[PDB]
């Protein structure tokens, strides 16, 4: 695993499968709370998306208001946003 990327990865669920290009409509999300180097879709699915995906920031400080965006209701539909680590001690 690569502790660098750790601090500066969140992973995204529960997102609509209407939505073609994830990597662009999360970028109006991602972007106004930070900078985004890079987002990886999966493709790998054979049959269906699987609605989720990765945004990695330049950042850590983009990490940290990422977490307030999490619960946020968007197209009607909350959004699940986590932590790559989590904090034992706050």
């Known amino acids: 695993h690569d502790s660098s990327k ?10 609509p499968y209407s939505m073609q290009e994830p990597d662009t ?7 106004a709370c930070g900078e985004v180097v ?3 879709p999966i493709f790998s699915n054979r049959g269906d ?7 990695e920031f ?4 983009s990490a940290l208001q990422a977490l307030e965006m999490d619960r946020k209701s968007v197209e009607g539909r909350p959004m699940f946003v986590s932590p790559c680590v ?3 001690k706050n």
């Open 6 to 15: 750790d601090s500066i990865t969140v992973f995204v669920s529960n997102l």
């Open 25 to 31: 409509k999360l970028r109006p999300l991602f972007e």
């Open 38 to 40: 890079q987002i990886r």
């Open 49 to 55: 998306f699987r609605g989720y995906c990765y945004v």
């Open 58 to 61: 330049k950042e850590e400080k």
């Open 86 to 88: 989590d904090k034992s």
